[PDB]
Amino acid sequence: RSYPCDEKKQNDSVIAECSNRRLQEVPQTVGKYVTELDLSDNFITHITNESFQGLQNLTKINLNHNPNGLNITDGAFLNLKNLRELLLEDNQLPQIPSGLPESLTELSLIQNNIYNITKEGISRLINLKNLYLAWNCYFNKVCEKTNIEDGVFETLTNLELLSLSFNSLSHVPPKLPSSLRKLFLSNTQIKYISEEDFKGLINLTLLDLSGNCPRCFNAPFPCVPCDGGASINIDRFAFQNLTQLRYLNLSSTSLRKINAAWFKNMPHLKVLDLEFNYLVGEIASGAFLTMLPRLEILDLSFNYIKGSYPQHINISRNFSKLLSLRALHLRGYVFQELREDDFQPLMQLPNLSTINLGINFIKQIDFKLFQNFSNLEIIYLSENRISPLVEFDPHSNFYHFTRPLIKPQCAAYGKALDLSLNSIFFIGPNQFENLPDIACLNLSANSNAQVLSGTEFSAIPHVKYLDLTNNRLDFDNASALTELSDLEVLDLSYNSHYFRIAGVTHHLEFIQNFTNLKVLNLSHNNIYTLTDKYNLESKSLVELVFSGNRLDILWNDDDNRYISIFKGLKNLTRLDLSLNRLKHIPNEAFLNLPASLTELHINDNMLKFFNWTLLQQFPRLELLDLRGNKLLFLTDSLSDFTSSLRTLLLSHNRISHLPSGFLSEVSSLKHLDLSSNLLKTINKSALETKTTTKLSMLELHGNPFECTCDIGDFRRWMDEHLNVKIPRLVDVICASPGDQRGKSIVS
Amino acid sequence: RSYPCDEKKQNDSVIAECSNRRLQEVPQTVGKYVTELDLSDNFITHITNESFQGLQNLTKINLNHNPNGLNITDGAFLNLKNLRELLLEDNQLPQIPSGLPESLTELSLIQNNIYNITKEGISRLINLKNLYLAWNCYFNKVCEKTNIEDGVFETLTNLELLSLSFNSLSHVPPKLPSSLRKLFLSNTQIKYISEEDFKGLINLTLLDLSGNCPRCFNAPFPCVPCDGGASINIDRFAFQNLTQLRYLNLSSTSLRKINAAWFKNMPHLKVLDLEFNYLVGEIASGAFLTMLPRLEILDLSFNYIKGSYPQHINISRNFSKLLSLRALHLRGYVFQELREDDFQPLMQLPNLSTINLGINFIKQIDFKLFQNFSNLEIIYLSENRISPLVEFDPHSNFYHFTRPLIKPQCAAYGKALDLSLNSIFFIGPNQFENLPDIACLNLSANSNAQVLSGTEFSAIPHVKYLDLTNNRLDFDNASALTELSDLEVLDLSYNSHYFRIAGVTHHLEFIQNFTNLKVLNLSHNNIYTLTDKYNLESKSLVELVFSGNRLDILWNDDDNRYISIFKGLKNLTRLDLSLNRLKHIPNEAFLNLPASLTELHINDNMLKFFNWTLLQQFPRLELLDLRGNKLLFLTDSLSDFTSSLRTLLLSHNRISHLPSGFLSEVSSLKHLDLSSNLLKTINKSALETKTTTKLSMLELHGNPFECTCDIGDFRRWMDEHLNVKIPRLVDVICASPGDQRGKSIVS
Numbered sequence A, B: 001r002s003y004p005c006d007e008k009k010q011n012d013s014v015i016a017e018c019s020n021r022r023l024q025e026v027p028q029t030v031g032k033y034v035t036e037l038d039l040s041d042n043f044i045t046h047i048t049n050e051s052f053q054g055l056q057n058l059t060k061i062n063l064n065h066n067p068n069g070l071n072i073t074d075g076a077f078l079n080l081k082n083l084r085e086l087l088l089e090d091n092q093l094p095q096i097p098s099g100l101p102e103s104l105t106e107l108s109l110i111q112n113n114i115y116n117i118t119k120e121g122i123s124r125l126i127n128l129k130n131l132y133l134a135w136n137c138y139f140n141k142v143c144e145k146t147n148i149e150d151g152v153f154e155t156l157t158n159l160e161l162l163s164l165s166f167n168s169l170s171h172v173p174p175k176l177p178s179s180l181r182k183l184f185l186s187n188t189q190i191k192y193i194s195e196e197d198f199k200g201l202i203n204l205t206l207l208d209l210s211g212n213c214p215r216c217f218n219a220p221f222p223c224v225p226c227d228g229g230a231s232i233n234i235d236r237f238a239f240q241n242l243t244q245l246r247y248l249n250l251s252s253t254s255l256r257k258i259n260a261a262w263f264k265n266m267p268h269l270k271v272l273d274l275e276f277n278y279l280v281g282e283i284a285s286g287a288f289l290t291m292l293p294r295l296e297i298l299d300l301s302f303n304y305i306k307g308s309y310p311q312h313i314n315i316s317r318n319f320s321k322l323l324s325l326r327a328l329h330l331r332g333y334v335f336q337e338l339r340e341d342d343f344q345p346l347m348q349l350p351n352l353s354t355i356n357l358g359i360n361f362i363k364q365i366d367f368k369l370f371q372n373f374s375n376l377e378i379i380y381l382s383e384n385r386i387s388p389l390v391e392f393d394p395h396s397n398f399y400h401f402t403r404p405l406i407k408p409q410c411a412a413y414g415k416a417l418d419l420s421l422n423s424i425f426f427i428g429p430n431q432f433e434n435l436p437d438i439a440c441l442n443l444s445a446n447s448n449a450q451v452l453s454g455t456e457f458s459a460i461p462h463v464k465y466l467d468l469t470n471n472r473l474d475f476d477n478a479s480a481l482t483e484l485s486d487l488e489v490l491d492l493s494y495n496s497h498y499f500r501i502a503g504v505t506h507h508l509e510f511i512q513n514f515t516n517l518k519v520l521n522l523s524h525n526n527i528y529t530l531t532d533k534y535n536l537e538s539k540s541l542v543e544l545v546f547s548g549n550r551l552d553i554l555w556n557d558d559d560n561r562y563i564s565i566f567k568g569l570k571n572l573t574r575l576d577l578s579l580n581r582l583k584h585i586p587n588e589a590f591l592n593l594p595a596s597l598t599e600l601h602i603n604d605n606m607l608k609f610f611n612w613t614l615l616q617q618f619p620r621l622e623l624l625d626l627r628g629n630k631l632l633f634l635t636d637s638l639s640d641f642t643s644s645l646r647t648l649l650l651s652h653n654r655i656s657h658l659p660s661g662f663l664s665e666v667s668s669l670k671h672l673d674l675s676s677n678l679l680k681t682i683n684k685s686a687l688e689t690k691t692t693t694k695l696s697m698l699e700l701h702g703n704p705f706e707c708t709c710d711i712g713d714f715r716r717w718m719d720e721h722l723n724v725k726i727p728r729l730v731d732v733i734c735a736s737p738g739d740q741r742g743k744s745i746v747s
């Protein structure tokens, strides 16, 4: 079996996953058919022409974050004739390594100490397509200004992407190759853009000039503005040859005025980022908006005027000219109320599907305005002040998060409205009156402490996914949420406020009324007592998440009231009982779990005992997760209790003995995780079979193995059953005797 | 050194703390001078007349929770002639042990399976003062009705306390000894109290008859009411001879009427518990209130009428007759508003110091009414609906928590007002207008998201302790809270809402304005970015809790802005930097910590390195807590860097080597905790000294010790330095070789 890497086929490639393994040097045991070697996050200090000798099939090597700087000799990689991608990020490299192979098409030197880009380093790398040199000198790091040798990129006639962001450049480098498609120059101290800087870049599709003359008020990083907080100075004809431009990033360039003619020669500009500028005036007038008919994304976030909290947002009539617009981001403009008249220019846009108004301190909204859009799909109003109606990831965006605004699982149902992190503490009878038909509603974190009673959502009765997490909801009415006839997903996580009070009444009977409820999450509610109806019932429910409650109290051996709590969930296939402080489950309570279960999690409890015999009543159980408990032993007759179990997770328990014949006849078991237990040895008889079984993954890392001659049988078993993958062999370590301690058992 | 117990002198006694040590049997190595032996929470299965042989000095033995049932032979303890207290709780005992010693004065058999109280078991125990037999048959436990042999307690002529609560008794046992002072009969299924039941109990000071004919609606336990939910039936003259009664517990007896004459012969009744009854009518009229002039505590909590949410609380004019009343508990009465007129009967009471109105769903209050009380000290209004002004511990109380209503540290300053767990989401200019002078104010968990600006608390400017935890406060004004000139303790824990948003402004400059601020808690605020002023400053602050923030971000090596964040806290002696995800502290940032520090906690971070040399700039540092980090090694020159360090906590780190001379010259160090590290051995040279040093406590449990001949020097060091206590010797275990694994190193 391969050691120390884990090999995986990925289409026309074989990846040797060898990261985060405490490797002091590159292993001389890499498979000859391995094409991509990931050695990131190890303690490798030196690379020589011997490091990867003979490994001619390598097309990619990742040495990022080594040593967790990296010493690379001249020509160390030269003999690898098929090497195309070399990642050397976060290696404290003082220079571009010398004698790199001419076959390289991608070279990443992000987050190093390289302040000189020389012809000796890269002129010979004529096949380079992508070159990343970002984040070598920035913020208050002690570093030198970047010297770019004149014409250093000129011979790179196939270069398509060049990134020099987060380096002190002062000027755009001259003599850039005309093959460039993407040029990143963010946070480079380039205060002036001349008409010659991008002269020959006729195939450019992306230009990033963000963070040059930055807007520094309240910056979450060391920020140095241009003299007098002045804007980036762009010559009138700087972009005249950028006819193929699709992406233009001018975020944090302290822009107050936008010359509409800068877009005259950009007939296909698609995404324009103007976040962190001073464009409230331009948003209200904006002649440049008339020069962007094929723009799809416009980001004008955080353009607020410090000290100004106006009553309304002032959107120019010229926003109506953005006929291709699909997403408009207007976070941090800052205004008190959003009225129908204020968004009239956006209502004629036929494909505007996302509107992001997060972080504007909005207090009130005429919700009826959202009925007058053609294809509005995401209405993102999270993090405002709406009340009841009367360190830096170099591979991500620096000015905004890139995750979906609304969870794709919620947004997939239809029109999505996100009102999370607001103050809609009480939903009165007219709160949702003039809203369009909403399918996905997020009301998380609104300080809502009301008793929902079946009428609050009557104006939007087709909500399919409702997120009410992180409120103080008082479940005190059996008719709660029943007006949502089509509800499929309901998230009530983190509403423990009233559940934790014994003396108040608690009612969860409403769950039974839903004909189409599939997923219900009651996590972290501290549920320990219910009033009158002790059971959850539903003919439709498929998944119930009950983690972070108190089944230790509900199933106390002196109380029989909750022994059938989940029995009525007749269609349930997934059940999560993690984090319920369970020391034991009464046998009658385990037997009352739905017989339809396919996946049962009881991880992260304090289980001292598990009655394996009871698996005879779960003929469809495929996954049993008992990780993070205090189980002391395993049954020797699992094969007699189940013919369906496929995955059994027992990591982080106190099992010190694997019984003889444990797996001999459990044919269905594919994955067994016994990692982080107290196994000192494994006898041959515990893993051997006399029949063909489906075991293909066995985890044993973190056990305190005794590496005397008594471990030989387990080692011989590993050699004789190569189809059973054992991951993390570097962590399947000897705890004793002293001479073997720390060494991997495979040696 | 004593093994396996830890011995401690406690006045005229020596306690062998031997609990929770995995002991399979009572050790035969108990010290001959030990007078109290605590063997609770072990795996002891058998007790014989050999178990404690020779240990004649034992006056107390605690065997509670063994085995974690206990098999006790007839006469096993008989030879212990000085044995006075024997605790045998939670031992699954089927009977009272036979042949117990006549010297017993206290016997506890709580939480066992004893359903027969016989003369064979206790008639000979004539010196018994306290006998606890509670919790043997209750709720849905499979158990038999308790048979009390006629006259079983009659020979116990010195019995002062008898507890039989949580057993099925049906009737009060006849022939109780007249020496009784406290009789507990709670939850005993005693539906009728006859005039003969307490006839001779003329010295009784406490009578507990709670839970007999219980009020079962919404009970957090299996509850069986009397037929037709009827009340406990008490004969008119049942309490005629209880002239010394001080405590009477009638909670959950389904009382609707209280006969005032039941108190005619109780001239000194002090505490009366009537919680969980149906006494709204009696609270409004209450003739019984005229018969309690020396009552100090009255608890009428949870007497609400199911389905009734009245506008006002109806307190009888007869509450004015409770002239000795000190505390009135009226939780769970349930009413919408508290007006001045409603509490007029309480205002004439001269020593009413506590009023508890928790859990009443109160929406509004005329706060001016609290100005008209003589000595109101605690105004407890937690867990209501106040909006902006327009399993069972057998040793605790079953019907209410016994902890202080308000933290003693807050209440000690003066008049305390607790408004936590309400909905005062915004403090307007008239919110505290008519409140009396408040010294301790709790506004925790009110969903408050306002920008405090220095005027909100102007009507109560002498608040000394202010708790604003668990809100959504927006620290966006430098003048916040500055009107509280005398503020000494400020708790801002759990107000992370706005701190976590980079794009909004954050202002903590207000801290500097307080002349008398001593303690500030900014825990769990996710603080990672501040606006304009990056430093905390204060001439008075003594303690700062900064746990649960992001010093990993504030002290990122590429940012110099926060390197002096705590330097201006010139009087600081205690600093908590735990839970800040720190991997390293920049040397300049550690050197900028206040030189006045005496106690520094940096526990539960991920520190890989600690620069020990920098302790030279902290001449008053006495405690350094680095527990729960990933430190790989220790300095060999700690003695050169400090002459003040007294306690050094390094548990839960990755130290595998103790350097030679580590402690030889650090004379001041008293306590060193190296538990749960990766020490395989300890060389003699690492702990030896050539000078007299103050080391007196060394923790080493949880290390993977190699028990070959190389551990002999450490064992000889332990034998030669007995003044250095090493706790938990049962957990100072051999990890290797196989033959020694699991055994204690002391053998």
Ligand SMILES: *[C@@H]1O[C@H](CO)[C@@H](O[C@@H]2O[C@H](CO)[C@@H](O[C@@H]3O[C@H](CO)[C@@H](O)[C@H](O)[C@@H]3O)[C@H](O)[C@H]2NC(C)=O)[C@H](O)[C@H]1NC(C)=O
Residues within 6 Å of the ligand: A382, A405, A406, A407, A410, A420, A421, A442, A443, A444, A445, A467
């Ligand atoms: C409704 O709105 C809330 C609040 O805006 C959304 O909550 C956010 O959900 C994301 C994704 O689950 C959370 O991110 C996670 O953060 C943890 C660390 O805290 C990390 O371990 C995960 O990998 C992940 O990145 C985010 O923290 C959370 N925000 C808050 C304030 O809770 C929620 O997703 C929205 N619901 C729907 C249906 O869109």
Ligand SMILES: *[C@@H]1O[C@H](CO)[C@@H](O[C@@H]2O[C@H](CO)[C@@H](O[C@@H]3O[C@H](CO)[C@@H](O)[C@H](O)[C@@H]3O)[C@H](O)[C@H]2NC(C)=O)[C@H](O)[C@H]1NC(C)=O
Residues within 6 Å of the ligand: A409, A410, A469, A489, A491, A493, A519, A520, A521, A523, A543, A545
């Ligand atoms: C409350 O419980 C629900 C149900 O478990 C949680 O939603 C579920 O979250 C999981 C984990 O993020 C989602 O699974 C993941 O889906 C993605 C996309 O398909 C996939 O790439 C991952 O491998 C994984 O399978 C799951 O789809 C999602 N279910 C639904 C219906 O949304 C929810 O996050 C819980 N809420 C809180 C606050 O924890």
Ligand SMILES: *[C@@H]1O[C@H](CO)[C@@H](O[C@@H]2O[C@H](CO)[C@@H](O[C@@H]3O[C@H](CO)[C@@H](O)[C@H](O)[C@@H]3O)[C@H](O)[C@H]2NC(C)=O)[C@H](O)[C@H]1NC(C)=O
Residues within 6 Å of the ligand: B382, B405, B406, B407, B410, B420, B421, B442, B443, B444, B445, B467
């Ligand atoms: C202001 O009011 C709040 C809310 O009523 C008080 O908070 C409560 O404080 C107690 C004592 O610290 C907390 O108890 C602790 O619980 C944890 C487990 O959660 C346990 O580990 C501790 O040993 C302790 O028992 C209690 O949970 C907490 N309640 C809430 C809802 O946070 C606060 O003490 C009041 N402040 C003053 C100055 O009195």
Ligand SMILES: *[C@@H]1O[C@H](CO)[C@@H](O[C@@H]2O[C@H](CO)[C@@H](O[C@@H]3O[C@H](CO)[C@@H](O)[C@H](O)[C@@H]3O)[C@H](O)[C@H]2NC(C)=O)[C@H](O)[C@H]1NC(C)=O
Residues within 6 Å of the ligand: B409, B410, B469, B489, B491, B493, B519, B520, B521, B523, B543, B545
């Ligand atoms: C925010 O930080 C403050 C300051 O550390 C916390 O208050 C302090 O809590 C500790 C631990 O409970 C108190 O110490 C204990 O005091 C008792 C009584 O004297 C003593 O028996 C214990 O041995 C221990 O010393 C300390 O007095 C208290 N300080 C003050 C001024 O109240 C507070 O609990 C923290 N808040 C949260 C929400 O964690």
Ligand SMILES: CCC[C@@H](CCO)Nc1nc(N)nc2c3ccccc3n(Cc3cc(CN[C@H]4CCOC4)ccc3OC)c12
Residues within 6 Å of the ligand: A304, A305, A306, A307, A308, A309, A332, A334, A359, A361, A385, B451, B453, B474, B475, B476, B477, B498, B503, B504, B505, B506
């Ligand atoms: C994304 C914007 C972040 C900041 C910017 C402040 O310049 N705003 C805010 N930052 C925080 N942390 N909170 C709030 C806030 C809370 C409620 C309502 C509006 C709010 N704003 C908006 C704002 C307010 C003001 C009046 N505030 C005074 C009154 C109290 O003392 C100060 C002036 C300009 C404003 O935006 C430009 C902010």
Ligand SMILES: CCC[C@@H](CCO)Nc1nc(N)nc2c3ccccc3n(Cc3cc(CN[C@H]4CCOC4)ccc3OC)c12
Residues within 6 Å of the ligand: A451, A453, A474, A475, A476, A477, A498, A503, A504, A505, A506, B304, B305, B306, B307, B308, B309, B332, B334, B359, B361, B385
């Ligand atoms: C300590 C009392 C615990 C329970 C007892 C209920 O019998 N009350 C409450 N339990 C919870 N979990 N919440 C609330 C609550 C929230 C806001 C205001 C009052 C509230 N009460 C008070 C109450 C209300 C009603 C009207 N509720 C209907 C309207 C909505 O559907 C039901 C009748 C009798 C009442 O007390 C007797 C309760």
Ligand SMILES: *[C@@H]1O[C@H](CO)[C@@H](O)[C@H](O)[C@H]1NC(C)=O
Residues within 6 Å of the ligand: A032, A033, A054, A055, A056, A057
């Ligand atoms: C490269 O892989 C091929 C096919 O997987 C194999 O035949 C060849 O020997 C390998 N070459 C080297 C140098 O390992």
Ligand SMILES: *[C@@H]1O[C@H](CO)[C@@H](O)[C@H](O)[C@H]1NC(C)=O
Residues within 6 Å of the ligand: A049, A050, A053, A079
């Ligand atoms: C590596 O380079 C050295 C000279 O520095 C040479 O002697 C050796 O043969 C080279 N090894 C390989 C595998 O090319």
Ligand SMILES: *[C@@H]1O[C@H](CO)[C@@H](O)[C@H](O)[C@H]1NC(C)=O
Residues within 6 Å of the ligand: A071, A072
């Ligand atoms: C890298 O290692 C070589 C020896 O293998 C040494 O000569 C050279 O100076 C090292 N480079 C650095 C930066 O230490």
Ligand SMILES: *[C@@H]1O[C@H](CO)[C@@H](O)[C@H](O)[C@H]1NC(C)=O
Residues within 6 Å of the ligand: A157, A178, A179, A180, A202, A203
């Ligand atoms: C894009 O333009 C440059 C010259 O202007 C050229 O080198 C490159 O190959 C062009 N793209 C294609 C696909 O030829």
Ligand SMILES: *[C@@H]1O[C@H](CO)[C@@H](O)[C@H](O)[C@H]1NC(C)=O
Residues within 6 Å of the ligand: A340, A344, A347, A348, A369, A372
């Ligand atoms: C609705 O949108 C149209 C453009 O499609 C606009 O002309 C009209 O005035 C809008 N009406 C309202 C009521 O907002």
Ligand SMILES: *[C@@H]1O[C@H](CO)[C@@H](O)[C@H](O)[C@H]1NC(C)=O
Residues within 6 Å of the ligand: A453, A454, A477, A478, A479
């Ligand atoms: C639930 O609330 C509705 C609407 O307020 C009310 O009509 C109904 O009586 C409530 N149900 C119960 C059982 O209180």
Ligand SMILES: *[C@@H]1O[C@H](CO)[C@@H](O)[C@H](O)[C@H]1NC(C)=O
Residues within 6 Å of the ligand: A515, A539, A540, A541, A542, A571
């Ligand atoms: C059970 O769940 C499936 C989806 O997994 C659903 O199609 C089916 O209708 C459910 N059964 C009932 C009775 O609702």
Ligand SMILES: *[C@@H]1O[C@H](CO)[C@@H](O)[C@H](O)[C@H]1NC(C)=O
Residues within 6 Å of the ligand: A587, A588, A611, A613, A614
């Ligand atoms: C498992 O459950 C059965 C049936 O409830 C019970 O008879 C048996 O004793 C349990 N097994 C163990 C090991 O306790």
Ligand SMILES: *[C@@H]1O[C@H](CO)[C@@H](O)[C@H](O)[C@H]1NC(C)=O
Residues within 6 Å of the ligand: B032, B033, B054, B055, B056, B057
């Ligand atoms: C009891 O303790 C005393 C004084 O501590 C000691 O002299 C005596 O020997 C002890 N007796 C026994 C039986 O251990």
Ligand SMILES: *[C@@H]1O[C@H](CO)[C@@H](O)[C@H](O)[C@H]1NC(C)=O
Residues within 6 Å of the ligand: B049, B050, B053, B079
């Ligand atoms: C304990 O009792 C046995 C009889 O069961 C007796 O032989 C033995 O001597 C007794 N031991 C002590 C120490 O009293």
